[PDB]
Ligand binder design. Structure first.
Ligand SMILES: N#CC1=C(N)Oc2[nH]c(=O)[nH]c(=O)c2[C@H]1c1ccc(Cl)cc1
Lengths: 424, 424, 317
């Protein structure tokens, strides 16, 4: 009559068994799904923690091929403004160049040149590009009289490949070129030198319009309705309804409201740890579920409430419940090493959320502080350098595990390899 | 016969500064001092000639902070001289080694060069003399046909202040300017925007030609003459004849040889720890001496049983050099900014730091992540940017000078007093 | 031009009190002393103007035991005046209570030298503060000397304390500025930040003796601030010359000190973490118990005798 549901296993209870392998670790595919509608080139998402994910680290996550969830320990307007920073991050073209209008007085243009130099001011009339003003133009009353007019401009259409533009610069013997839309409205500016140095991120997570992807977290408190609406107006790709107990009337209804009110935004629900919670979130319309309740030993949930589910079994039970639905599941918590990340994938996660592991990187919030001959971030977290090096080690280990199991892609890794149970 | 004990010698922990009447705030005291007969420093900091501490990149940062670095000698002659050159030739905004063409270069070849460097301009040189530029506009046979001629060139003579160049760029309504010398040989290329965005270092240690100062270490082995001559030709400001036992025929003669052979370069000898050694190096021609033999529980003491506690060594050397105009550099034994203050009051003109600068961003080595922490690899903790440590060390010195009522380094060295304390 | 050592300077662990012929029981000696020219105390104990030690509640306890508290200044002007007013208006019977002419419990308050100091002093004086403690890291300075002169001239009916100092010359300079007492202690402890960051300090036994000799015959008391770990050190500070001793951290965590009691891993702490230490009176009782035993050992019937007659031995490691 002691109601024991099952024996539940954690990461240290299992090991992956090697299997026949034909694909080298460097050649396997890591592509996966965050939600019904969002694909990621690596199975990594950064946690909505105020020591982990603000705009800077979310941009870096998306560039690596995963995604960041911006934390909610801030005001509604600030959270939306963080989303905007990610959506607006552009790698090559310059979007807000300093312009003037035909009516601008040359006296005023010369004042702006004390800060900006003489490389050239675009001339705009209500967003229409009508010419450019160069220092050479000032060298041979309003800029309408001296500007180079529209029929001498060399421009590139918005959306032209960055390598087609470099070629047009060369053909025209120019270094700068203005970018316009179909109607000759100014849309930005590219430089030959800036295309050359333009670091590129071929794995970047991008939406259908080419902008970096980003998520944002919300609770179930009173202003959630207004926070979700601001995040959606900002272009957020995914809203994470994120509480300690996702299997609750509060979370289920908030997920339903988001899915009914903002049908075209992805919604994740959690956290959960059972098949039946997974089903309740799927039926409320969740586009993905986040798995993890007291996943680690000695941890407030276990010590204070005696509640928790070992994370291997929690992941496997959720994956079993969702097989066929099309709803991914994100493993949240208990990963301390890359080996644990590989086990979470074989147990059925579609990808993995990391938190404190990313805290203290250069891209995470906080300022670098020198303490007692050591580096910390303060707001005392040790300073960890660039996020790319951590991502590289994690994905390096996952690739290694896919080599040992003969898994050529994530779908195989999630469904084919086997564990052994060990004793310690 | 009896036990030949010369004196009781005090180290840093034996003494404390007595507070005195003060009416100058720490932020307002002057830290200006002298490294040698002929080199002034804005802060009394010198980075040590260690191969985990001082190569070009850290030497540049030390000089910009107002101190100086001694480039280490654990490298070949030509490699050390190249490190000197990188410091002597470092510039904020002026691009050096620009891609050039000649008046005879064929326009076909220039177009091939533009594929990689783009347009915006190739200086035209004729055996190093500047005779024109080729811009994209000039292209819309040979470069001499199309090149903009010498008389259309806006040039500034090298060594002009940056704000001076920035003004000339403004006056002529251009973005690029060429830097020339007395005979119009090309020296570099500077742009308005590179100047507007360059960091200024108002405290920088510079020579009479405006170049960052640097020193370099030599020993007494057989290739020392060749090494010294290569360092002098590279522009080194000071040669440090740097051995474990400065009070020796080999160091004394090598200091003398440097002073007689290279009259125009400053020479430091060391290390020493007695009045007698101080007089011997000053008589040999040294422009400063370096103090420190076995300053605290180290290899010299354990292996050879040799050393002089550093407070007494500094004061003994200081008394021996009083009235000679030869400064002394305290080297070794400084754990804390408080020890640096004590060294100054005992008579040092400045302090050499070693391993405290190891592991900074600018120090040699690469950053690695190990166990959620950051180190420098070549096993040292990553300490962040040099300026943080420098700021801490000088902040403590400033506080000591506030406590002693010292308004400048000269007062700090000659007026304040110590108490001798017990082990208790 | 040799190394400029003014003297060897001794701390508490360098010295011990020598027993002397004795005729008084510890239970019978007198502990009365002065805090300032105009303020007597029945025990020579002062609580520190630290935000972990002295707000109104602990100043109230201190004055009831016969000492006094200095309210800290890490708070607003009106707030700190409110704290002073709480003490002056409080009636709990307590036979040793430190009280002013009106029968109100005595209290002090700290101020600095920054910009708003003039308004802070004015507000504290109007709340009834008994003594203004002009309290900086470096009392031998233009700022402190001029502020104590300003207080003595603008508010001649309050007592003024200046510090901290550690030399004879600084003591005489504060006295000439009008100080009613000086506070002694610059870098008193082995690992002061002062010592580590600036290399500055004076071991406290020598600092106290030097300041006491400089103020002899002036009527200006001196308060030993810092370095007291045990009641034995308190005894030594009195024999070196102090009139009373100021405790800080040792009072932190008492029931009366600021902060909120919290339970962490089966232990109690004050949540601002320091351990919970129970009632202040037990600590004050142990300290005065140790001092009474020292006076019994040395033969001192009262504080004047304890400050002037007994001798130290110097000891080694
Ligand atoms: N000196 C000069 C210049 C002259 N004469 O022409 C122009 N015409 C412009 O329109 N902008 C310019 O910035 C310049 C500068 C220039 C200097 C060096 C290079 Cl490599 C390229 C250009």
């Amino acid at each position: 009559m002691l109601r024991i549901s099952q024996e539940a296993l954690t990461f240290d209870d299992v090991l992956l068994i090697p299997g026949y392998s034909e694909v080298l670790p460097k050649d396997v595919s890591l592509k996966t799904r965050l939600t019904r509608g969002i694909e990621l080139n690596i199975p990594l998402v950064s946690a909505a923690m105020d020591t982990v994910t603000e705009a800077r680290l979310a941009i870096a996550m998306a560039q690596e091929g995963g995604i960041g969830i911006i934390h909610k320990n801030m005001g509604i307007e600030q959270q939306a403004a963080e989303v905007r920073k990610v959506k607006k991050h552009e790698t090559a073209i310059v979007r807000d160049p300093v312009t003037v209008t035909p009516s601008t007085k040359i006296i005023e243009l010369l004042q702006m040149a004390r800060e900006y130099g003489f490389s050239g001011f675009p001339v705009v009339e209500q967003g229409e590009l009508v010419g450019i003003v160069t220092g050479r133009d000032l060298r041979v009353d309003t800029v309408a009289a001296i500007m180079t007019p529209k029929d001498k401009l060399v421009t590139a259409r918005e959306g032209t490949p960055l390598e087609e533009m470099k070629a047009k610069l060369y053909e025209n013997r120019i270094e700068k070129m203005l970018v316009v839309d179909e109607n000759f409205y100014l849309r930005g500016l590219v430089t030959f030198r800036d295309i050359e140095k333009a670091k590129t991120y071929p794995l970047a997570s991008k939406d259908e319009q080419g902008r970096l992807r980003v998520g944002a977290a919300v609770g179930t408190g009173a202003d959630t309705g207004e926070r979700v609406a601001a995040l959606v107006a900002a272009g957020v790709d995914v809203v994470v309804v994120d509480t300690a107990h996702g299997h609750s009337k509060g979370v289920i209804e908030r997920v339903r409201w988001v899915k009914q009110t903002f049908p075209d935004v992805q919604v994740i629900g959690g956290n959960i740890a059972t098949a039946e919670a997974a089903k309740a979130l799927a039926e409320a319309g969740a586009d993905a579920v986040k798995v993890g309740i007291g996943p680690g030993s000695i941890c407030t949930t276990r010590i204070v409430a005696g509640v928790g589910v070992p994370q291997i079994s929690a992941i496997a039970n959720v994956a079993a419940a969702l097989e066929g639905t099309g709803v991914p599941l994100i493993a949240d918590g208990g990963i301390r090493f890359s080996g644990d990340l590989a086990k979470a994938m074989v147990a059925g996660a579609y990808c993995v959320m990391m938190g404190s592991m990313f805290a203290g990187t250069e891209e995470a919030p906080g300022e670098i502080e020198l303490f007692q001959g050591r580096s910390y971030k303060s707001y005392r977290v040790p300073y960890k350098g660039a996020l790319s090096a951590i991502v590289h080690q994690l994905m390096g280990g996952l690739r290694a595990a896919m080599g040992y199991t003969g898994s050529a892609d994530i779908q195989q890794m999630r469904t084919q390899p086997q564990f052994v149970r060990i004793t310690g």
